[PDB]
Amino acid sequence: TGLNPDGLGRTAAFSNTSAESVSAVDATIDRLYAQDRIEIPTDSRQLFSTRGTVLRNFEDLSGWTANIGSLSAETSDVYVGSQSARLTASSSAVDIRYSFGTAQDFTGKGFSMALKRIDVSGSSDSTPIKIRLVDGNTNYRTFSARCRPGGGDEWGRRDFGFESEDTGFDVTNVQTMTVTTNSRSSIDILVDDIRVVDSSGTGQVIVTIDDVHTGDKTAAEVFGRYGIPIGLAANAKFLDQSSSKLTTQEFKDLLAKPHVYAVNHGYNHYDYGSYSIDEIEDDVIRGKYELQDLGVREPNINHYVYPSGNYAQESIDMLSNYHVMSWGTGAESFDALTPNQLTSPWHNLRCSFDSGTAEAEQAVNDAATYNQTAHIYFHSDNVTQSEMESVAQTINSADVTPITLMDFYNQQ
Amino acid sequence: TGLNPDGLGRTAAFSNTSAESVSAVDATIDRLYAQDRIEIPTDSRQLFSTRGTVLRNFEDLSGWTANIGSLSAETSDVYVGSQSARLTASSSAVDIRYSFGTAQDFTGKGFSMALKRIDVSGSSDSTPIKIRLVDGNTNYRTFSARCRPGGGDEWGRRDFGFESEDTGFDVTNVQTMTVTTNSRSSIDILVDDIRVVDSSGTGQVIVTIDDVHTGDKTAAEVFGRYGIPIGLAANAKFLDQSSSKLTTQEFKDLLAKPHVYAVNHGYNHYDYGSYSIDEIEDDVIRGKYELQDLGVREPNINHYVYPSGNYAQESIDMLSNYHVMSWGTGAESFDALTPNQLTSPWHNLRCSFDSGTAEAEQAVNDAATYNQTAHIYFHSDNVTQSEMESVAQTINSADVTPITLMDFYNQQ
Amino acid sequence: TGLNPDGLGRTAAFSNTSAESVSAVDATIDRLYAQDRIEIPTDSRQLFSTRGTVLRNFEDLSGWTANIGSLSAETSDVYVGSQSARLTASSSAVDIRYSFGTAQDFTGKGFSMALKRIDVSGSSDSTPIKIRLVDGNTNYRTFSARCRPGGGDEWGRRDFGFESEDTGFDVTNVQTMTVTTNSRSSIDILVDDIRVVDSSGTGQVIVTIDDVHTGDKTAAEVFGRYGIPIGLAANAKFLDQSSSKLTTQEFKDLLAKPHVYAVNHGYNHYDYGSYSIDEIEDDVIRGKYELQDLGVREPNINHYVYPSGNYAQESIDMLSNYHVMSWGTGAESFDALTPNQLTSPWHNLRCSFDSGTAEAEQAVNDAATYNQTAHIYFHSDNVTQSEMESVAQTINSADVTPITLMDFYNQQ
Ligand SMILES: [Mg+2]
Ligand SMILES: [Mg+2]
Ligand SMILES: [Mg+2]
Ligand SMILES: [Zn+2]
Ligand SMILES: [Zn+2]
Ligand SMILES: [Zn+2]
């Protein structure tokens, strides 16, 4: 035992102690048996924010022309440097453009930008924001991301997915770059700090299945036919609730298959806005430990997927104590697509194929074509076996590496 | 000190506590002094299992020709997808061939495959399994790995070491690939999911010395002449037992040398089958903490070398709580060799040079020539100083990077 | 709660416990809430020491000729192998030369060497040591590092920054390697194990600001104008001391900016030699936990910058329990400079630009030109805003990636 430790207050020398909960200011442990971390040491929020090189700076707007809408310096609400740029428009799209002092070669370069939504209203309270490159021939190439409420309420980087290209665009001879939106009754959004990242590696695909439906069994068989790895974005309360969701044994048996892995999606799927940050934190913590009891270990259980795609900087700050990376939701090919090097592991989206495989298969083919990473997702109740087989065969026939979320985060 | 925590049961507010053992469900620690992990958060077993791309699928056997032996679909027992290939043969080898719809280029690629042993019997209950590529000239190039009892009793991936090449083989212009065994009185094995991985980097060499014999001093001096890293696969009980084993001070002094590092080999060298999984787990745990007391810290002490080379999925499952990677034993060049990218950190072997340096020097030259990683090993009682000098000069003269196990795992 | 644990001595079954300090031999924790590590599991001291390939081993001095000074095989005192080279000179420099058996190509290679100071005296206690390549035209190219008291008192690898080049030096056709010093009344230094590492990737810049002076606000704006990331080498006691040092809220606000990160510099700036190792360890530990309370999380708070640049192997040994990487100080361009691949994360220096920007802007231009990493530093009280703008524009105009210390360590 020894004698009692040094000091005042209740001090005790024990042999063996059992407790439900231990709070300690400091703990000196000679040998630690604690593989099941809830609270992770890594804060991922700002690690990736300053990768690559700043291509466009916004610190002086003399080089930018407002083509449509309006542009002004914002020196109070600054992402980086001395100022950011306010983009503002009424009943109109905004389009601003910058002309290079010499021809730019952007072969193997992906694009990223800082964004904050102040106001957007019209056909949606959101807009696609599009980085358009333009060549010496006036062909465009478009990369895009979504400015939304919640996830855009505070400054956050988007890593832009390929969207479209005018046939024969000369990426070696880019003469201007342009930033533009859909038209709305009101637009007020801030931007800053455009970054260029090396994306010269192969294209890559990530597949996630949400919400632990019984069809995940047939999904695992289908995507298994080409060794494509599936992430089960798992809610542990949903297991054994009904015939429509996996049993505990089915989930464990699925995760034993070498291509299936689990990521956290909250114990009871508590989404942002629908619940308080505290209740979501409990859902996150409980999701983590329940999945760890089901054998989901560290590199896997460091990933989270936003319940119902809802998020904000509030939820990101909370989640950063427990997870390193998270994914939202979108309907279109550019939502799935990111450069291979991220600059935010929190803000990026996934393309749904619950509504039809077109946008996902467009993303997979574009991932191959333009050397990008595509994240595609579904619920296995919504999607038929034939739809899964279309996507699986698209991925097998494309020039992409199918990868886990763990692999993708390890590449950063 | 404060007042007692919220709750029923025995609750206590302490200042300073000492314990031999603490069991907690929840531990909230504001500052952690616990560098010596026993139980690691990372589960390496299935992380690497979906690296690279599935080259050959076994999901439809219409494309496979049974040259010798016999081939059938297994659908009750499947690594990946809807099916796996059963290979069955009597008083013969099995050899199955797939002819490509167009010429294949495998320059800088390495190969991997999923395997399970159902039965093998004859002169040995084990076989080399060989992936043979064949060119437009009918030159072969062969890579291989071993199907063994224990390590093949459940599905596991092998990552295939180069073995042989017919002079002038055109790796750019492969027309067919072949899976084949040695001849045996009975063969019954399942295969699935052949994977191609990028191995276009330089060749690499890893040297391990097992069981802490006193000759490790001369070994350290010899391999030190060319700064080649030595892994001591260490049993901490063996230190100070006899004049034939290192003293504690000698072992610490060896590890202070910049090229020497320690990996776990069980406190008392308990091996699979010879002892229960529980006893081996205790030996693994004690090995880890005794070596940590001797100063062997995290990236080093995350590696384990199987005692007497014995293992199975039972032991891998247990070891995955404590270690990230383990290595078995073999006698030939294709044992030492792997692609630079593994798909299993658990199933791969090492070539002995206890009996003679030939197959190890072959492995080093193959690693240089064909861009692969070679792991070579010995006991320093079995090997004379001039034999070590032959191997050390072989490594120094070859085009390979000599690396640590830590470096190799960080590259995955 | 359950019944009391197995054992003699004081045993207890608790529900909820609170403690200031817990000492445990074994802790079995089912769910760990301990993001704030003080003791890190990783021991970085010898991980990188045996990267790359040994070029000159000094294990046979038949190939070496003294141009000036004297040389012997040191067999009593050896970094690597059977021997080291003892370099000794009186009232003179030393310069020793090895002729290559053929034209070496060192395009994209960087250089590293083991060093120990026995004695250096005269005009200084210390010397630049230069690795000095000679081409087929008798042009030199020079890389260098500093031999000093303290940091050189025990064997430690230096990774050599570019220093100078005779115009038109053919790096593809190198004919002789030379090792040389400044002239001194006494020189007695041991060298061993010259290593070659691949540094063919892009050049890189790391910017650190020391000692939390209020000018860090203007620095954040200036380097922010180009998205270059700043490391605050932070002392947590200094916050709120004076108008001349940041407030706690200013420091937190600074670290919320995506390009500003914090690294430890000791709670109260206790430097080696000035205080005992125990006092410095307390300063290191308190620095770590106070900065963790300010929100500085794991990958950031795993870096430490030496207070007043003072260090030895004693401090490195102690620091290795808490940090992975540390940086000293120097006045000149080669002090900033390293290959992209280190071999010691502990012995490398930073170039001051407190005394004018010239040597740092030389280092930035050389980082671009020769594909190297440059670490530059200042105190924001010493440096005017125009000097910061000169450095910031130098970095933005150069061909370098500006990076965090975290990014740099993740690349190793
Ligand atoms: Mg700005
Ligand atoms: Mg299969
Ligand atoms: Mg030596
Ligand atoms: Zn969901
Ligand atoms: Zn052994
Ligand atoms: Zn300082």
Numbering used by the authors:
A (entry chain TB), B (entry chain TC), C (entry chain TA): 2 to 413
What wording appears in the published article?
Each hexagonal MCP of HFTV1 forms the base of a turret. The TBP inserts into the MCP hexamer with a short stalk formed by a six-stranded β-barrel. In icosahedral and asymmetric reconstructions of the capsid, the turret heads were poorly resolved, an indication of flexibility. To improve the resolution of the turret map, localized reconstruction techniques were used (flowchart S1). Particles were symmetry-expanded around the fivefold-symmetric head-tail axis, sampling the five particularly well-defined turret complexes adjacent to the portal. We found that the turrets are assembled in two possible orientations, where the turret head trimer can be rotated by 60° with respect to the turret base hexamer. This rotational flexibility may increase the chance of binding between turrets and the S-layer of H. gibbonsii. (E) Diagonal view of MCP5, showing that each MCP6 carries a turret, while all MCP5 remain unoccupied.
